[PDB]
Amino acid sequence: DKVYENVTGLVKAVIEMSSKIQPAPPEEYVPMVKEVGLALRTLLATVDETIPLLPASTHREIEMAQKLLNSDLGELINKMKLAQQYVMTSLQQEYKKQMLTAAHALAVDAKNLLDVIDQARLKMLG
């Protein structure tokens, strides 16, 4: 199940970033966000490969879930940059928190993409 493997890899990269966000200084964030973004890229390519075999009536819902992940990555990158802009200020930890919140949203939405695909696989069995 490459979709499950890819979702696992993406969520693991998010959990890693979330244990390193508070200790790490805001300008070592880029490699962690990059590892998350590339895990997402892998996942999206796998889902694109898988869609043609799932029932047509499920494609739209899967496609919306994919788009949500894109928007989530955008927000993560934005919050990362803000956390960088506000290092050693009065807002440093607040923007680190916002970055954390964006990464968590990404992980949750990846799990929901898996759930939608898994339901479409069930329908396909029928």
Partner: peptide
Amino acid sequence: NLXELDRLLXELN
């Protein structure tokens, strides 16, 4: 969705 992601990713290089 892949196109959009790949240009989002450009920002991290």
